[PDB]
Amino acid sequence: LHSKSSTWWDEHLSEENLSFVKQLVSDENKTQLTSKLNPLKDEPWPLHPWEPGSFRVGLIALKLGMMPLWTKDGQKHAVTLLQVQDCHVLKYTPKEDHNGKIAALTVGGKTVSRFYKPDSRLEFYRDLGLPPKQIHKIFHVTDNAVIKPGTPLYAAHFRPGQYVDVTAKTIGKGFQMGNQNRTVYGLKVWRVNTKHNIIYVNGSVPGHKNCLVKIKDSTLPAYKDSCKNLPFPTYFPDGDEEELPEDLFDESVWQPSEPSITFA
């Protein structure tokens, strides 16, 4: 019959070729990621100084889980684990073309397979030179803080002691609900792991484990200007001005292997 038929990527792939295809995809993903490792060496856009009222870009992270944390005062605080995976700038929107108030930047993370994705999504990512990402989110960023597309973003952008805001889809409870975006405000950051790009955030985060979340600077009036003492555009490992410790701790946080706390 001269009619449409259902097809999948594995329909016409032989076992020997199928194994080769799997290896090739890993190689292609690795090559694309390595090419984008150095943003500063890729004709970076001009760097501007920080001034009051500037807004930095946010990151997308995966909800690893929760664990207990102890402070030097002996208090126990439960903390949630967020992992930033393959965070890259994808599309910059001019201030006029998106919103006169502020410009916006699109950031995607958590690379996904190319087998079951639309050609249009692949075509856009092919131009950007990066593998497709699970989720696209838009961040409001001031003109001075704009970053060229394709710049890798790392968990080191945020620092211990900084309050942050996380928004994620709430768990769906079925017909009775849920599956709606919600935001939690005023969550402090206790520690960041550079090697695994893991950020420790105070409190609970809406959504199920292994769920992507959006991380951005706290918008509360008290923390109006916290980026002055932080990497203003972002943290660039490419510069490598001073290699950061693998694990970053807050002053109040009691590090493991420290002497037992005595309430003297």
């Binding site: 690893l64 889980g65 207990p68 002996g74 684990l81 695994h196 484990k209 292997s257 706390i261 309430f263």
Partner: protein, 217 residues
């Protein structure tokens, strides 16, 4: 080879990396504070820093009745009767405010949980806080106490007679007739002993953990 319960991770979708990082921190803390091997039914004395007091430590002695938690958040509970009042205190193994842990008497009890001791006679739960440590053999199995405790009147916190509890240290015969046991046995659910859906295999995980713990040492 005694693998402490907390090191064994629980089944789930959580990333194994968290356990690896947690174990590394746990092992580092173990160097700072030595965690002796103990089992439910062992009498322990634990030294902890007092927040209310200034520069004064606290030591509480009691029989270990329950072990719960995993990873750095693992906790253990030891029970004792002080001034005629039964008291149970839960101690977190890796809390920085626990100065020292002493196993006064290393031993095991018939059951892995001793919550039924609340329903037992006070003498089975009474222990001298100042009792000195008893001799123990490192290269041996911990002594297993096979004494069967006597229960108080029938109203109890839990229906220990039910087969699900499967308590082997209770003198049910003295307080319960065989007919009453049969009524409790009505909840036998015999297929549960043969059910493979409630079984979790950690043999490979337990073996792998042993080398990792020793390597850090």
């Amino acid at each position: 080879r005694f693998l402490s319960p907390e090191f064994i991770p629980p089944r789930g979708r959580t990333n194994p990396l968290k356990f690896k990082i947690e174990r590394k921190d746990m092992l580092d803390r173990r160097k700072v504070l030595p965690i002796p091997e103990f089992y439910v039914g062992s009498i322990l004395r634990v030294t902890t820093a007092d927040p209310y007091a200034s520069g004064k430590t606290s030591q509480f002695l009691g029989i270990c009745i329950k072990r719960s938690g995993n990873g750095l958040g693992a906790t253990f509970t030891l029970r004792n009767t002080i001034e005629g009042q039964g008291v149970e205190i839960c101690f977190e193994l890796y809390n920085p405010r626990i100065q020292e842990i002493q196993v006064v008497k290393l031993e095991k009890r018939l059951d892995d949980n001793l919550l039924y001791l609340r329903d037992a006679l006070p003498e089975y739960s009474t222990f001298d806080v100042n009792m000195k440590p008893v001799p123990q053999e490192a290269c041996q199995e911990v002594p297993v106490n096979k004494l069967k405790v006597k229960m108080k009147p029938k109203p109890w916190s839990k229906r220990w007679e039910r087969p699900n509890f499967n308590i082997k240290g209770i003198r049910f015969d003295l307080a319960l007739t065989e007919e009453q046991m049969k009524e409790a046995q009505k909840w036998n659910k015999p297929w549960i002993e043969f059910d493979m859906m409630r079984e979790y295999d950690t043999s490979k995980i337990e073996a792998a953990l042993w080398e990792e713990i020793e390597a850090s040492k």
